[PDB]
């Protein structure tokens, strides 16, 4: 598996369509500061289902859609399509090439597609999670990860090792169970208080 092509239209600073054809080895993305090269990273995060606004360097609809410039009026639609080579069947999809598409409209509506078939965000997230490319994978690394490693608080550094260990789903289930316990006890407490005012 590898990235074949990133098509971007109306996303952040890419007012007209761009199309990055990656090579199998090392593709470098370069250019003057502020001229948009890190919007390539944001577009890859976004189409793969990132919803953290912090992770996206702006993840709200007005941040995503080209907002206008001296050169051009704002657009009402942003679209990204990532095409992946699936020759080795790394992704659990019976297709030689897998395309993931994300759109957001100024009106706030969003569309998600896999191989041009409408789906939910969860289907994109689950597709990459099931193949070992979910939230904890180190398939996208920005300077924030270096900062976490270099942090003075030991919890920040441990977090990197917990991602590598794939503990998030266990941690989440543990917290879900602890919250169930708390809310069950809290509901009982509130019932007993209502009942006590009836006495």
């Amino acid at each position: 598996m590898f990235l074949k092509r990133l098509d971007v239209i109306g996303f952040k600073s890419f007012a007209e369509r761009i199309s990055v054809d990656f090579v199998k080895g090392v593709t470098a993305v370069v250019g003057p500061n502020g001229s948009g090269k890190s919007n390539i990273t944001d577009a890859i995060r976004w189409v793969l289902g990132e919803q953290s606004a912090r992770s996206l360097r702006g993840g709200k609809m007005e941040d995503i859609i080209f907002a206008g410039s001296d050169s051009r009026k704002r657009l009402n639609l942003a679209e990204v399509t990532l095409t992946l080579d699936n020759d080795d069947h790394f992704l659990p999809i019976d297709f030689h090439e897998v395309s993931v598409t994300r759109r957001v409209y100024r009106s706030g509506e969003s569309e998600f597609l896999i191989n041009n078939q409408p789906c939910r965000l969860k289907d994109i997230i689950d597709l990459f999670m099931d193949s070992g490319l979910g939230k904890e994978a180190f398939s996208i690394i920005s300077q924030g990860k270096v900062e976490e490693i270099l942090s003075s608080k030991a919890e920040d550094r441990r977090s990197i090792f917990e991602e590598a260990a794939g503990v998030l789903k266990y941690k989440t289930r543990k917290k879900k169970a602890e919250n169930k316990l708390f809310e069950t006890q809290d509901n009982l407490n509130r019932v007993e208080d209502i009942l006590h005012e009836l006495e």
Partner: protein, 181 residues
């Protein structure tokens, strides 16, 4: 007055608590074992990855409290070639950045990925160290496709192709591309 529905609510609570307690302890068991197992594997690569990036030296990973596998921090101790062996806290800015990259690349040996987007991760490298970083990427690009956003010229020199992103018109990014390989 005592109520049947209240008494059943208390019994349901007690019943759920017994199972949920077992969920929580198993989650704790999974997290302790997986954290330690993975730590051991990452540690097994760290010295070698460090040395290939620095061109020498040595480095170690160590649990801050090895008997607290749910909360222990991780100490990083490293010796850049020509320097003393020290906690990561006391190394130079450029040494710290490269050591962190060594940890990330050791994690990638343990948890490999088919493609890896690096967004300016080597911004704080000392210039003298950039070429070994860049050569690391070329060498291990046989197993991982690397997409590298960079402003370091040494990294560009080792890439197969370059995509330039620049605003020819105000606020609108244009993209051009050149092959090097």
């Amino acid at each position: 007055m005592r109520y049947k529905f209240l008494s059943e609510q208390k019994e349901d609570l007690t019943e759920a608590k017994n199972t949920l307690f077992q969920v929580i302890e198993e989650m704790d068991e999974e997290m302790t074992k997986r954290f330690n197992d993975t730590f051991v594997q990452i540690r097994s690569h760290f010295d070698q990855v460090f040395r290939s990036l620095f061109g020498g030296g040595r480095a170690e990973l160590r649990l801050t409290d090895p008997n607290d596998l749910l909360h222990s921090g991780v100490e990083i101790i490293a010796q850049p070639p020509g320097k003393k062996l020290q906690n990561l806290n006391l190394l130079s800015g450029g040494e710290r950045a490269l050591t962190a990259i060594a940890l990330l690349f050791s994690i990638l040996k343990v948890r490999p990925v088919p493609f890896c987007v690096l967004d300016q991760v080597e911004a704080a490298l000392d210039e003298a160290n950039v070429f070994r970083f860049a050569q690391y990427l070329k060498k291990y690009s046989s197993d991982t496709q690397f997409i590298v956003i960079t402003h370091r010229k040494g990294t560009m020199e080792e890439a197969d192709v370059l995509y330039g992103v620049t605003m020819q018109e105000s606020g609108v990014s244009k993209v051009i591309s050149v092959k090097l390989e």
